[PDB]
């Protein structure tokens, strides 16, 4: 199944934050309506916050997360969870190797802000 | 029901990261077996990261998040999500006021780490 | 925070299914747009499906689950999860007693159907 | 990533319930310790319950859900959610065709039971 793609409410500010847990250098791209809106990169095995940014879901609400390591696309897992019918989290994990921890880059999207 | 309380695997490293979205200064306390292990503070209405840290769940595995604003504990919502039977998120929102966005302080706990 | 209230897409069919795991008879009421749309009752300590039904979310999309034992409201917990940006589950647990399993009645709402 | 595999606590009862939303006949297999523990087959486009059973998780606690239609394995999506640090849901969707609803068979696993 497709993973790392989320439909947000249109024209809504959201946070996106990436964490690294791998020997490999992670590169995370965040697309909004297929336009590159953010790119984060770094290397840590201790959960470094390689990037955090406020974006806007725009007219389409379509947000996609992609992760690669020195050009190789990582396999993704994802889900969205809503608390008290209001508070939204869109979650991504990614695997760059063979141990299947899916934590090599972790991406958390949250809304609403403010 | 109790919120913001999570049983992690014993003696396991985890990340904890807090974001703020309130006019008020948020204080986030992370407790491991009922003892404060990290404290973050800050004020933002733009989802700023007010802290991030790596902790160990210790011999009991018991982790709790508490949030307070202007000397007053905030109400919490929370849940845990597991993706591909491996990647764990413990998610918390908090409400300090009247509007019920539960985003005043947003706290993300993730494990395993690298 | 409010629990057991979900916003579904308008004019969409959904399933609602209730399970019982308590010494006490559970009553589950499902409201759509503030009108009772389904009701199930039963006692089981073995996860009986005390009712399952297909409903339409109508113009509002507002769906509320209430659980009671002989007229006494149970405390609820709830969340919504979305898989592959398409498959939705709204989840409710309830506690009628002192042991805090929140499984006394468990309610699952799923959409889309068909 | 692997989907439909969940680690439950050892020697613990859980409920499994399958719903169908497809023109095709769905076959849902539940494997406990890599051996078939339940099988459900049926057809509905109205979310009918094609099986519901209580099972034990056994020594390893490893539970796997597989879905097929006309003998051809369906693609799966899944996740696990925990409410109030106690109430567990393991959730599976499956796609037998081209429309990507992942509702063709929907499987809900819940624990603890009464
Ligand atoms: C070489 O493998 C990569 O780096 C290791 C230190 C681990 O984080 C592993 O999950 C990751 O895939
Ligand atoms: C005074 O109210 C607090 O600050 C505002 C700017 C909002 O973020 C609100 O949710 C928060 O409770
Ligand atoms: C009297 O307690 C009720 O019935 C028991 C058999 C348990 O299922 C318990 O969770 C429930 O609250
Ligand atoms: C022919 O396609 C199958 O049956 C239809 C009635 C739909 O439920 C569709 O999702 C399913 O994959
Ligand atoms: Ca890895
Ligand atoms: Ca890793
Ligand atoms: Ca608020
Ligand atoms: Ca706020
Ligand atoms: Ca109980
Ligand atoms: Ca019970
Ligand atoms: Ca389908
Ligand atoms: Ca279908």
Residue numbers in the entry:
A (entry chain B), B (entry chain A), C (entry chain C), D (entry chain D): 1 to 114
From the paper:
All crystal structures belong to the P21 space group except for the S23A mutant that crystallizes in space group C2. Hence, amongst the four monomers that form the asymmetric unit, substitution of the sugar occurred in the four monomers of PA-IIL S23A/Me-α-Fuc and G24N/Me-α-Man, but only in three monomers of the S22A/Me-α-Man and S22A/Me-α-Fuc complexes and in only two monomers of G24N/Me-α-Fuc. In case of mutation of Ser23 to Ala23, the original hydrogen bond between Ser22 and Asp96 is retained. A new hydrophobic interaction is enabled between the methyl group at O1 of the fucoside and the side chain of Ala23. Mutant S23A is even more interesting. The affinity towards methyl fucoside is almost two times higher than in the case of the native protein. The native protein displays an unfavourable entropic contribution TΔS of -4.9 kJ/mol, whereas the mutant shows a favourable entropic part of 3.8kJ/mol, making the total difference 8.7kJ/mol. The hydroxyl group of Ser23 in the native protein interacts with the fucoside O5, creating an unfavourable entropy contribution. If this interaction was absent, the entropic contribution would become favourable for the free energy and consequentially, for the affinity. By replacing Ser23 with alanine, another interaction is also generated: the hydrophobic interaction between the side chain of alanine and the C5 methyl group of fucose.
The present study is devoted to the PA-IIL lectin from Pseudomonas aeruginosa, an opportunistic human pathogen capable of causing lethal complications in cystic fibrosis patients. The lectin may play an important role in the process of virulence, recognizing specific saccharide structures and subsequently allowing the bacteria to adhere to the host cells. It displays high values of affinity towards monosaccharides, especially fucose – a feature caused by unusual binding mode, where two calcium ions participate in the interaction with saccharide. Briefly, the structure is tetrameric with each monomer characterized by a binding site containing two calcium ions and a saccharide.
